Write a protein that binds this DNA or RNA. Structure first.
Length: 171
RNA sequence: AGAAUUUGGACAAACUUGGUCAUUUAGAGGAACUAAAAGUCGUAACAAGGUUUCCGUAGGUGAACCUGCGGAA
């Protein structure tokens, strides 16, 4: 059995130069066989006769979604990780500054969200993808949604500090 | 038309010299009203929110990358 994964037209040459660090966890660690079909701009992962294919396809889907090699390998190992994709969907007002409210000046609001709840967020123009543990993704998603739907930055920053502490706390 | 004699002089600034209004009294009294500050340490309070990944153009160019503008997820 096999899986196909497309490669978008912005993550093809980074995939190409870092392909030599992608395939050995598909080949000797997980025991699949792979080929990157340049024709349909995809990758075919097949099994050999000597359930790994879903985890390998999720590692490749992380790389095509735009997480780097190391975060894709962090999803590859560490079975308590997930990755949530959502567009904004919730143009001058509602879109041209909502993603600037997410990212902030020099990416520091997205970075503060990332470090506070221990997730990695890749931000497209309007497509947000969050890599991390379950409750981590939950609090990151609530923060992102709170400041696309309009909250004080002081409010969402205080909530990020509180969320960092209570996510690390026992009892 | 000039000079002095003027022929007869209406006029005349300034200088003495009393009643009028405005101000300075050098000053000095009188007898009214109002007014009158005695409180360590106070802050930096202060203002919006385009990141990542490729693509093209233009320049600075180890044609590597960056920057500016225009695109894609």
């Amino acid at each position: 059995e096999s899986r196909k994964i497309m490669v978008p037209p912005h993550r093809m040459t980074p995939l190409r130069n870092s392909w030599t660090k992608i395939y050995p966890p598909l080949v000797e660690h997980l025991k699949l066989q792979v080929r990157m079909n340049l024709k349909t701009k995809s990758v075919e992962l097949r099994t050999n006769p000597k359930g790994a294919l879903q985890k390998g396809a999720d590692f490749i889907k992380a790389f095509t979604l735009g997480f780097d090699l190391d975060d894709s390998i962090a999803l590859l190992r560490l079975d308590d990780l997930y990755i949530e994709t959502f567009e904004v969907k919730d143009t001058g007002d509602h879109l041209s500054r909502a993603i600037g409210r997410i990212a902030g000046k020099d990416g520091k609001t997205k970075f503060a969200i990332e470090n506070a709840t221990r997730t990695r967020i890749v931000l497209a123009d309007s497509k947000i993808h969050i890599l991390g543990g379950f409750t981590h993704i939950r609090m990151a998603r609530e923060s992102v949604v709170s400041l696309i739907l309009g909250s004080p930055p002081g409010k969402v920053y205080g909530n990020l500090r509180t969320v960092a502490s209570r996510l690390k706390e026992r009892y």
